[PDB]
């Protein structure tokens with residue numbers, strides 16, 4: 001699978017029929033029909049002793065991997081029951097400023113969407129968690145052009161190292177706290193992974209406030225390649241799956 005004409009989102013269902021399931025992601029978040037839930041506990045993001053490991057271009061995105069062997073960088077509270085361990089961070093980006101995000105707000109698309117993937121500790125590990133309807137919790141954060149984001153610059157500075165599919169680099173000492181906006185107000189609903197296998201295991205927590213990135217950072221994030229080294233260059237842009245039917249799901253908001 002990929003994002004091109006012959007292996008993109010429209011072809012996914014053939015190998016992963018769950019693509020046409022009852023709780024696929026992303027979805028459009030209609031801000032008016034979203035149900036404020038005053039009973040949600042505040043979301044707790046404890047990235048305090050996160051332990052980043054490596055960054056890799058797997059041909060679909062850059063992916064910062066973390067040590068999830070014990071409770072280091074976790075997500076709790078909010079709609080979450082239990083504790084969720086951060087395992088990875090990757091980005092969906094567009095070719096133009098008005099596209100790139102997977103989730104949309106009242107049909108509006110952002111220039112990019114960062115996904116911070118967490119798994120439920122009551123399951124043992126990531127592989128086990130993805131066999132559970134509540135095994136993952138993914139934190140989605142929109143990116144809009146504005147001032148440079150220091151936390152993203154860390155990534156920006158290593159992009160040439162991992163330009164093509166299969167290249168990886170050491171990425172220890174990266175503090176994922178620098179990728180978060182001031183406000184933790186969010187929308188939440190039960191969904192899926194947005195890339196094959198598209199498993200329906202996730203509690204999505206999409207932050208209302210996007211983080212800003214400079215025009216220079218955005219351009220650099222669009223310089224990665226989908227292709228492997230030595231093959232014809234295919235810039236890694238528009239690596240996003242479109243909004244999926246919401247079916248009978250309800251999106252809740254943590255704010256009024």
Ligand SMILES: [Hg+2]
Pocket residue numbers: 129130131132133134135199200201202
């Ligand atoms: Hg699942």
Ligand SMILES: [Zn+2]
Pocket residue numbers: 090092115194
């Ligand atoms: Zn993603």
